[PDB]
Amino acid sequence: QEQEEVITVRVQDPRVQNEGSWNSYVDYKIFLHTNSKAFTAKTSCVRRRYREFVWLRKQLQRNAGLVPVPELPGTFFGTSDEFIEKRRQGLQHFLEKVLQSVVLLSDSQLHLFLQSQLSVPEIEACVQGRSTMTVSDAILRYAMSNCG
């Protein structure tokens, strides 16, 4: 009934950023609560857009060996709100599956995606050792800030 380690994830609250402009896009709130020793922060709240998930999947596959990486949601014939809701569902399912794998949970790019608001280029730099702070400090600083 009660597992030793639980990781709960929710993708929620899609929002249009820069609405009406060239740089308009939808992002998604990602909430996480866990007691997993793989994680630095017990709770986190970040926002990520679809192209960032696309990046994340590719990166996970790079390091995953033979552990299969879950597929993302991808024509669509409904309204934009209906498309966004289907996508939101698919992103939630993607992350649930990813979080079942001890191998995928060992990837620091995942942790910075979920528990920091570093940009993709920042995450890449951080895990390549080119940033001024460690993966842990990026995640702790975000936690201790009130940004989520």
- Residues within the interface to Na ion (CB under 5 A): 26, 37, 138, 141, 144
Q: Is 48 annotated as a binding residue?
A: no
Look at residue 108 and give its three-state secondary structure: helix
Q: List the strands of the sheet with 25-34, edge to edge.
A: 7-17, 25-34, 43-49
Q: Is 130 annotated as a binding residue?
A: no
Residues with Cβ < 8 Å from 143, sequence gap 6 or more? 40, 41, 44, 115
CB of 146 to Cl ion, least distance (A): 16
CB of 97 to Cl ion, least distance (A): 7
Site mask, Cl ion, residues 107-126, x = CB under 5 A?
Answer: ----x---------------
Binding site, annotated residues: 49, 87
